[PDB]
Structure 1
Amino acid sequence: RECISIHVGQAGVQIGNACWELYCLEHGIQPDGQMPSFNTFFSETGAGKHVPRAVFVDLEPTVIDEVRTGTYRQLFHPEQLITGKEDAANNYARGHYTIGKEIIDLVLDRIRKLADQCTGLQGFSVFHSFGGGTGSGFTSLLMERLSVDYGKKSKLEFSIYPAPQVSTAVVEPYNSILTTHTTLEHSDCAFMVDNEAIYDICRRNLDIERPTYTNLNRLIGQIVSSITASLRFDGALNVDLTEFQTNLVPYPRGHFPLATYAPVISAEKAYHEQLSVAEITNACFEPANQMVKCDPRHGKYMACCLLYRGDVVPKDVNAAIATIKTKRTIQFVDWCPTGFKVGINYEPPTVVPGGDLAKVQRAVCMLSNTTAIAEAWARLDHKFDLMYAKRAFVHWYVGEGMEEGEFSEAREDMAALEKDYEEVGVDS
């Protein structure tokens, strides 16, 4: 019943920092590993120290060093903290090939070591970003190997969705297009969120006009914990990760369920207001709490999964579902009946001490696969096209051995993906 977390790149690792901090908060784990009390994620020592079963990869020493100098440096095993010396430079060509390919063997052997520590490997999940060099480059490299060795294990990916308006990486389209090509075909499911959309959540629901990544990742951590800690904890409907895959992936392509999370409420907003299960789920179908800037009303739904924490009575859930099925404007694709996975954990929602979110007594996470995602690809299509037509920055990949045909090909694979969304949109 075990799983492995993999943190690649800054985004992967810094999100991971929040994630493991939250898992410590879930059980009262001390920075040194001492836990007085979740062995699905952790491995126990004779001292009662538990080791989070995870791998941290950075090709630049700095971020891992940040871990190594922080409080959780005692928690993590030195072998889990893997670092190279040089970067990918925002570039798949080095991340996947030239540079990252050198260290990956080590990385894999640490993974395999942990796989041998697992007794019942259920699977794993990889945290990264769609635009970066290691964030997406190296990441797909890893999938190429992991899908061989662990072909039957859960291969869930979580990635930051490139913001349409702000991006620090000029060749991000190129990176992301190459990842599509290689991840679609290897991964089982990839989830993503938009930091821009999140900012809007922070300013509207948390009332914060100063979000940093350390805020943004707390919110992400919430979502992740709902599906990682609480799915291993007790509930009414205990849903596994393999079950998630078995209940969220409808086609052999990928699919890309997007996150939505409600409650996201400031402490003051929690006052004077009573949420019910149904009210929280109402919020879950509002564009306003959509974690990716993509309009839910534009597309049609294919999948939807609702996962519940704390004070949730199935009775209320059932009523809530009835209304979301019938009251809303949620259009859905023919193919699908509304079999929405309901996970119901008794495990209460948790809050980070010193965080922004209010203590809540119940909480709902929503995953959804909508046809509007093709518009996200359309965004990438043109951004890629523009660059590629001019061949701007192309020498930074070509010099590492990339082929122009390959890039065209990858775009075409994306186009095919868009076409399949088109297909799904056609009802039948």
Structure 2
Amino acid sequence: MREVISINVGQAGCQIGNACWELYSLEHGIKPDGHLEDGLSKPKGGEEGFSTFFHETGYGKFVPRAIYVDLEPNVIDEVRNGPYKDLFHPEQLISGKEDAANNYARGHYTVGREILGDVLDRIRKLADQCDGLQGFLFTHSLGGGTGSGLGSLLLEELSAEYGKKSKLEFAVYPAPQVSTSVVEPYNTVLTTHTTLEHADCTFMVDNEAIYDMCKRNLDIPRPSFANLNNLIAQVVSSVTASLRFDGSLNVDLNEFQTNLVPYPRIHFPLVSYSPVLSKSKAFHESNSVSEITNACFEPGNQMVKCDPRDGKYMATCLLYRGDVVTRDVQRAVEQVKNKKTVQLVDWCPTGFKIGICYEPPTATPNSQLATVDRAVCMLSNTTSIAEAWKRIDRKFDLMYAKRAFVHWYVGEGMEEGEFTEAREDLAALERDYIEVGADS
């Protein structure tokens, strides 16, 4: 339970993985060469971390255990040009000459299943090299159907392979307003059922919310995909803060599994991070921890295009960085309960988990961040997720009415039966989620 395997699938997934590895290097002060980087600490690695993501070698050079898979050679060449490839092993990465399809047709097809055995034996060899395992981390965008199908195939193969560690999947969601890809809703809906069958826990993040945040909080005129990558890297690092750096209240992955799954089928947590702001305003403004807890409930920090007030509260967790006073956060959570911002349920209500980590948050130079000694990462289970599901499903059905494209999918690897089945599965999931949220 000391190692976590991270997988980078698709173009956006590979970029996010690159950003997370760069941020992990920056937190521990790791340079492209390293050898640890360098050997003086304790707790920059060793000891753990790095012992959860970076593989320890006989020479001491920490190899970040990452598997970059994509059938687009340009992205693979790009990620090979950087020093990250030197950090990784040349055999860990997988290359493809011709992209699967646009986008989910071949990504889930048997052509995408041909490399399944290759990557499976790669993962088996990597596990044989290391010692112990806590879970499987996944990084693929639900917008990219290629990455979606490939990640679902890997998740199914890992569930059929080990089934002993919690399968984590970080999914990127497109903007509900505009969609550049016309089959993007089809790919996402078809992938939802696969992730329901395979994933033990999910992560839903919206690009449009990230862009609104960086335009508003960081006060930037021009958003960039690199800024989104940096923000998601900060998020992912905030998730595994206790596993990398020791804190006053070290939290476990199994604790996340217990808190986020209080029912037979509840594995959809929403992410919120605060305080996030421009570094200049961070130098100008100094808020309290209660203000940060309140901003955690704002619609912007939730990284979703849904209002959290209509959502119904469920079991949530809050990770804290740097120095954090227990009595202060107790007072803050009591004040929050007194506010009754999000409507509470009858099962969970006393469901605010608190975890503290000594590692203070780090601000990347590319993307601004509120420079503060203590950060707050809230993983909630509000019922706005059902709202996003219905929002995308309405457009999915409006399309599938005429669907304008079904010939390609039914000829390549699919059929209208599979589309109808995925639609019914999404509808049943929405109905069950609304039911479990409304019975309180």
**TM-score, normalized by length of structure 1?**
0.96
What's the C-alpha RMSD, in Å, of the aligned pairs?
Answer: 1.5
Aligned with 2:400: secondary structure?
A: helix
Query: 3-state DSSP class of the match of 2:427?
Result: helix
Offset at 1:108?
1.3
Instruction: Determine if the alignment matches structure 1 residue 134 to structure 2 residue 146.
Output: yes
1:1-400 alignment, distance < 5 Å = 1-35=2-36, 36-37=38-39, 38-400=50-412
1:404 to 390, 402, 416: 416
What SS does structure 2 have at the residue aligned with 1:127?
strand
Structure 1 position 395, deviation (Å): 1.6
**8 Å contact kept, 1:156–1:188:** yes
Cross-structure match for 2:42 = none
Deviates more, 1:12-21 or 1:232-241: 232-241
Q: Residue by residue, what CA displacement relative to the aligned partner does 1:61-91 show, whole Å, maximum 9, x if unpaired?
A: 1112111101222111111211111212233
Deviation at 1:109, TM superposition (A): 1.3
What is the identity, as a one-letter code, of the residue corresponding to 1:239?
V
In the alignment, the residues of structure 1 paired with residue 161 and residue 7 of structure 2 have an alpha-carbon distance, to the nearest angstrom, of 15
**Distance in 1 between residues matched to 2:254 and 2:22, nearest whole Å:** 24
Name the SS of the counterpart of 2:20 in structure 1: helix
Preserved CA contact (<8 Å) 2:324 2:356: yes
Give 4+ residue runs of structure 1 displaced > 6 Å after superposition.
none
Mapped partners of 1:68, 1:237: distance in 2: 38
Are the equivalent residues in 2 in contact too, given 1:236–1:346 (CA < 8 A)? yes
Shifted more, 12-21 versus 231-240: the winner is 231-240
Q: Deviations over 1:149-193 (max 9, x none)?
A: 221202111110121122221111111111111111111111111
Cα deviation code 1:306-357 (max 9, x no counterpart): 1100121111111111011111321022221222221110111112234311
* Mapped contact 1:59–1:100 kept (Cα < 8 A): no
Question: Equivalents in 1 of 2:196, 2:411: separation in Å?
Answer: 26
How many residues get paired? 428
Question: Are the equivalent residues in 1 in contact too, given 2:106–2:413 (CA < 8 A)?
Answer: no
Contact 1:371 1:425 in 2 (8 A): yes
Question: SS where residue 279 of structure 1 aligns?
Answer: helix
Asked if the contact 1:84/1:103 (under 8 Å) is kept, the reply is no
TM-superposed CA distance for 1:33, in Å, is 4.5
Matched-pair contact (CA < 8 Å) for 1:90–1:131: no
- Is the Cα–Cα contact under 8 Å of residues 197 and 291 in structure 1 kept in the other structure? yes
Name the CA distance, whole Å, in 2 between partners of 1:354 and 1:13.
18
CA displacement, residues 200-233 of structure 1 (integer Å, 9 cap, x when unaligned): 1111111012111101111111111011244331
Query: Per-residue deviation at 1:278?
Result: 2.1
With over 3 angstroms needed to count, the CA separation of the structure-2 counterparts of 1:249 and 1:90, relative to structure 1, is: farther
Shift of 1:380: 2.0
Q: TM-score, normalised by structure 2?
A: 0.94
Report the CA distance shift for 1:115/1:252 in structure 2 as closer, same or farther (over 3 A). farther
Is the Cα contact below 8 Å between 1:128 and 1:136 reproduced in 2? Answer: yes
Whole-Å Cα distance in 1 between the matches of residues 194 and 289 of structure 2?
Answer: 39
Contact 2:315 2:349 (8 Å CA) reproduced: no
- Aligned residue for 1:176, secondary structure, equals helix
Q: Please give the alpha-carbon distance, in whole angstroms, between the structure 1 residues aligned to 2:95 and 2:150.
A: 13
Unpaired stretches in structure 2, ≥5 consecutive residues: 40-49
Give unpaired runs (5+ residues) of structure 1: none
Provide Cα deviations, 1:269-308, integer angstroms capped at 9, x if missing partner: 1123223322211210112322111110111012311110
CA distance in 1, matches of 2:87, 2:241: 18
Alpha-carbon distance, 1:359 to partner: 2.4
Higher mean alpha-carbon deviation, 5-14 vs 271-280, is at 271-280
SS at match of 1:185: helix
The separation in 2 between residues aligned to 1:366 and 1:88, in whole angstroms, is: 36
Q: CA deviation at 1:382?
A: 1.8
Letter of the structure 2 residue corresponding to residue 30 of structure 1 = K
Tell me by how many angstroms 1:250 deviates: 2.2
Contact in 1 for aligned 2:142/2:172 (Cα 8 Å): yes
Give 1:107 deviation, angstroms: 1.1
| Larger strand proportion of the pair | 1
